[PDB]
Design an enzyme around this catalytic site. Structure first.
Site, PDB file in Angstrom:
ATOM      1  CD  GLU A  35      -3.279  -0.780   0.108  1.00 53.02           C
ATOM      2  OE1 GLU A  35      -3.125   0.710  -0.210  1.00 53.02           O
ATOM      3  OE2 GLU A  35      -3.385  -1.694  -0.058  1.00 53.02           O
ATOM      4  CG  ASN A  46      -8.542   6.775  -3.939  1.00 57.16           C
ATOM      5  OD1 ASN A  46      -7.378   6.257  -4.416  1.00 57.16           O
ATOM      6  ND2 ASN A  46      -8.994   7.025  -3.158  1.00 57.16           N
ATOM      7  CG  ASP A  48     -13.808   8.362  -5.183  1.00 54.46           C
ATOM      8  OD1 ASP A  48     -12.862   9.074  -4.651  1.00 54.46           O
ATOM      9  OD2 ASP A  48     -14.416   8.003  -4.064  1.00 54.46           O
ATOM     10  CB  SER A  50     -11.884   9.362  -1.850  1.00 57.77           C
ATOM     11  OG  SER A  50     -11.206   7.994  -2.188  1.00 57.77           O
ATOM     12  CG  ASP A  52      -6.567   5.534  -0.936  1.00 54.65           C
ATOM     13  OD1 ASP A  52      -7.260   5.361  -0.739  1.00 54.65           O
ATOM     14  OD2 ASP A  52      -6.016   4.862  -1.560  1.00 54.65           O
TER      15      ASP A  52
END
Ligand SMILES: [Cl-]
Ligand SMILES: [Cl-]
Length: 129
Positions: A35, A46, A48, A50, A52
Site C-alpha cells: 500500500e 482516487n 472519485d 477521495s 488514501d
C-alpha cells in the site's frame, strides 16, 4: 517516516494487530508494504476525489476527514493528516475498525491482490518479535 520491515512488524505487534480478527502479523506487514512501501507519509488520490493516507492507505471517503471529500464520512473520527504521523497508533486504531466492518482485509486492494493466499509469514521472517 519509512519503516523497516521488522521495525514495522514490532510496532504493529505492540499495537495489537497480530492475529487481530484472525489476521496474522505478516498480513498487515504485507499490506503496508504494497500500500505505502512502509512510508507513513504516502498519499494517493482516487478517481472519485477521495485520498488514501498513510502506511495503510486509509481512504477519506469513509474513514477520516481531509476537508476536501464532499459527502464523505469520518468513521475513525480523525483528520486524515493524523494518519501520516511517524507514530502509527492512529493508523492502527483506524485499521482495526476497518477490518472489523465485515469485509476483513479485503478492504485493502493491495492485500487482496498481492498478499491474500501467499506465504505472508515470510514478511516477518527473521524479525525479533
Ligand atoms: Cl504471519
Ligand atoms: Cl493491487
Amino acid at each position: 517516516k519509512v519503516f523497516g520491515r521488522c521495525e514495522l512488524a514490532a510496532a504493529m505487534k505492540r499495537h495489537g494487530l497480530d492475529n487481530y480478527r484472525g489476521y496474522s502479523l505478516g498480513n498487515w506487514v504485507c499490506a503496508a508494504k504494497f500500500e505505502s512501501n512502509f512510508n507513513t507519509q504516502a498519499t494517493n488520490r482516487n478517481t472519485d476525489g477521495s485520498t488514501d493516507y498513510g502506511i495503510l492507505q486509509i481512504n477519506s471517503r469513509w474513514w477520516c476527514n481531509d476537508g476536501r471529500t464532499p459527502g464523505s464520512r469520518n468513521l475513525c473520527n480523525i483528520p486524515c493528516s493524523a494518519l501520516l504521523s511517524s507514530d502509527i497508533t492512529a493508523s492502527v486504531n483506524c485499521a482495526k475498525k476497518i477490518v472489523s466492518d465485515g469485509n476483513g482485509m479485503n478492504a485493502w486492494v493491495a492485500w487482496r491482490n498481492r498478499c491474500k493466499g501467499t506465504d505472508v509469514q515470510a514478511w516477518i521472517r527473521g524479525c525479533r518479535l
